[PDB]
Design an enzyme around this catalytic site. Structure first.
Site, mmCIF file in Angstrom:
data_model
loop_
_atom_site.group_PDB
_atom_site.id
_atom_site.type_symbol
_atom_site.label_atom_id
_atom_site.label_comp_id
_atom_site.label_asym_id
_atom_site.label_seq_id
_atom_site.Cartn_x
_atom_site.Cartn_y
_atom_site.Cartn_z
ATOM 1 N N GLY B 53 0.710 -1.031 0.073
ATOM 2 C CA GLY B 53 -0.116 -0.144 -0.054
ATOM 3 C C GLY B 53 0.926 1.336 0.147
ATOM 4 N N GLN B 54 2.142 1.003 -0.611
ATOM 5 C CA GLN B 54 3.198 2.040 -0.582
ATOM 6 C C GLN B 54 2.808 2.844 -1.863
ATOM 7 N N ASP B 55 3.232 3.827 -1.990
ATOM 8 C CA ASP B 55 2.783 5.129 -2.435
ATOM 9 C C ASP B 55 2.167 4.904 -3.743
ATOM 10 N N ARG B 58 -0.231 1.737 -3.812
ATOM 11 C CA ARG B 58 -1.601 2.245 -3.514
ATOM 12 C C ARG B 58 -2.113 3.030 -4.422
#
Lengths: 177, 159, 290
Positions: B53-55, B58
């Site tokens: 859910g990293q930048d 996500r």
């Protein structure tokens, strides 16, 4: 590199298949080449022509030409072997001769260029063996059975969990003088 | 079914996964991307995207915006950090409609690993308390623990 | 309102890989024009991180390679990082051919966000006992050196030490080719070393030095003896390639009356031996120059 492209040719004014080692331009280098090749320049015979310091190297093999191109010097024989060698390889690679078979085994054929020749270097011998290297392997399998299995065990178990929960010199002196 | 493991994966969110898959653990660099497995049950084979859910990742999942069928939320139960913030994000899932085609599981992972919240405490906190047009029984795991999981799930495919 | 893009999609299901193969060919042909309109990307995306079909992957991959990739999507389609992680694994793959093949591809490949930890990855792969794999790195690196040399910066030496570790002629040959392009100096140092040993050895690697030496003198000399010592040994000369070059290099180097003679002989015999006429003419041409 010692060849920016190998293009296998049929008589048609057109080269039956080709691959571009390096892209930049457009076919017009290749396209132009194709045109010239088709034209043959009416020229009678001779399996080699280099013009304008560009080797156009070919071999009629039948109604087919197998073609290589280069511009600055080379050791011939090696080269020949290759043209010829191509002429050994194909019925194996793509099956016999007629464009189509090749049309189906394009991927195989291109793969063969790379495989055979890594940038103008004669890589090996033994066609079958050549098959071997990829899409024909061994290691991967060895690994897979064990591994897949191991995981599988974990999985199986899981299913339950889930389920329920002198000479030199002569020269040298002379020169030296 | 497309089952979704999101949050930033590399934390052992991925561990959580690798543990399922081989039994093993994160022996990858902490993993932003799709991790895929198919797990077969009811022989719906659940295709798991363990995705950080990293930048970007996500940020960008639109091709994966399609229609869901299963929810794992893999949890740092030591995280009790991005969850409110998460709640704030989470709404937009809620505001998605594809997202209402899954009877799910939030999985509380990373319990041993520091601690965890009231099963309830969390429940409001991600905004979880509030659903119903999807089922919503709750299941804790850890990432060095978790069982009965499958009860949660059991109901879930059989929703 | 509907389209055959979809027609292809069902086929793929229908067969699996097989149908897809067909699809690749079509796609290819479609691709070949330029031409396509997107959407199958999604399909591809969907099935492929969870799918094998190695050959297909190879087709796929190549397709990616030939086709653009800094695609109007980006740059990347934008997943150029995520999918790669499987691939990275493959690249990692214990599975050596598989890595090698990738590497081959990889030499062709040049996609940076993906590269960076693959730099690490590659480094590991070099260690793998397969010369095929290792060799493949030599191309790959070559590919870096122009594209993002820097990406790796410590390399020229690293190689050079590597050479020390090394002993597969094939790889060596390669090693030289690249090494001089990075820097001659290392090769030279080694050259000093090798001077006696050469004679024992296989040609191909030997050749490569002959080019290098040439450029530098016109710019500047003072270097001779060490060379000479060898060079005389080279005045054995015996492969048709070797000989072909050997007289050719000599002239490049020298033109003393004695020199004139030496080369000349080589030709004359050569010719005499010679058979391919095409060849014969060529030397003349040189001669014509001469």
């Amino acid at each position: 590199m010692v060849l920016l492209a190998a293009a296998v040719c049929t008589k048609a004014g057109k080269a039956i298949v080709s691959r571009q080692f390096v892209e930049m331009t457009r076919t017009r280098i290749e396209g132009l080449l194709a045109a010239f090749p088709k034209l043959m320049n009416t020229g009678k015979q001779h399996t080699f022509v280099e013009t304008e310091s560009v080797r156009y190297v070919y071999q009629p093999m039948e109604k087919l030409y197998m073609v290589l191109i280069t511009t600055k010097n080379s050791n011939i024989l090696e080269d020949l072997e290759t043209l010829r060698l191509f002429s050994r390889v194909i019925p194996e690679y793509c099956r016999a001769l007629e464009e189509n078979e090749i049309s189906e085994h394009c991927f195989d054929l291109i793969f063969a260029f790379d495989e055979i020749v890594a940038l103008g270097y004669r890589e090996n011998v033994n066609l079958a063996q050549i098959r071997t290297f990829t899409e024909m392997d061994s290691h991967e399998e060895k690994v897979f059975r064990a591994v897949r299995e191991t995981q599988e065990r974990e999985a199986k178990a899981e299913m339950r969990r889930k389920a329920k929960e002198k000479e030199v010199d002569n020269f040298v002196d002379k020169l030296k003088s | 079914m497309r089952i979704l493991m999101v949050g930033l994966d590399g934390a052992g969110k991925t561990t959580v996964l690798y543990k399922l898959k081989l039994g093993e653990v994160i022996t990858t660099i902490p993993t932003i991307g799709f991790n895929v497995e198919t797990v077969q049950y009811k022989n719906i084979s659940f295709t798991v995207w363990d995705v950080g859910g990293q930048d970007r990742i996500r940020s960008l999942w639109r091709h994966y915006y399609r229609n869901t069928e299963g929810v794992i939320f893999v949890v740092d139960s030591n995280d009790r950090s991005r969850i409110g913030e998460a709640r704030e994000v989470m709404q937009r899932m809620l505001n998605e409609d594809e997202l209402r085609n899954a009877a799910w599981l939030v999985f509380a992972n990373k319990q041993d690993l520091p601690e965890a919240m009231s099963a309830a405490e969390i429940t409001e906190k991600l905004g979880l308390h509030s659903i119903r047009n999807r089922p919503w029984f709750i299941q804790a795991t850890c990432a060095t623990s978790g069982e009965g999981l499958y009860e949660g799930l059991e109901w879930l495919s059989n929703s | 309102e509907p389209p055959s893009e979809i027609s292809l999609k069902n086929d793929l299901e229908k067969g699996d890989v097989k149908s897809k193969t067909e699809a690749l060919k079509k796609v290819i042909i479609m691709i070949l024009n330029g031409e396509k309109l997107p959407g199958l990307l999604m399909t591809i995306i969907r099935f492929v991180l969870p799918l094998q079909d190695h050959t297909i992957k190879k087709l796929l991959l190549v397709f990616w390679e030939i086709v653009p990739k800094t695609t109007p999507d980006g740059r990347l389609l934008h997943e150029m990082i995520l999918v790669c992680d499987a691939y990275r694994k493959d690249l990692q793959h214990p599975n050596e051919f598989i890595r090698g093949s990738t590497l081959r591809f990889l030499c062709k490949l040049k996609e940076a966000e993906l590269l960076e930890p693959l730099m690490p990855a590659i480094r590991a792969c070099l260690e793998h006992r397969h010369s095929y794999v290792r060799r493949n790195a030599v191309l790959a690196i070559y590919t870096i050196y122009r594209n993002f040399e820097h990406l790796i910066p410590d390399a020229p030496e690293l190689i050079h030490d590597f050479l020390v570790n090394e002993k597969d002629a094939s790889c060596k040959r390669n090693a030289f080719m690249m090494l001089i392009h990075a820097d001659q100096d290392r090769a030279l140092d080694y050259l000093s070393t090798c001077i006696d040993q050469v004679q024992t050895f296989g040609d191909i690697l030997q050749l490569v030095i002959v080019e290098l030496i040439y450029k530098v003198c016109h710019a500047n000399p003072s270097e001779r003896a060490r060379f000479i010592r060898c060079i005389y040994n080279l005045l054995q000369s015996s492969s048709p390639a070797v000989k072909y070059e050997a007289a050719g290099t000599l002239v490049t180097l020298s033109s003393a009356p004695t020199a004139i003679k030496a080369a000349a002989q080589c030709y004359i015999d050569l010719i005499i031996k010679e058979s391919d006429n095409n060849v014969k003419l060529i030397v003349l041409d040189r001669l014509v120059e001469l």
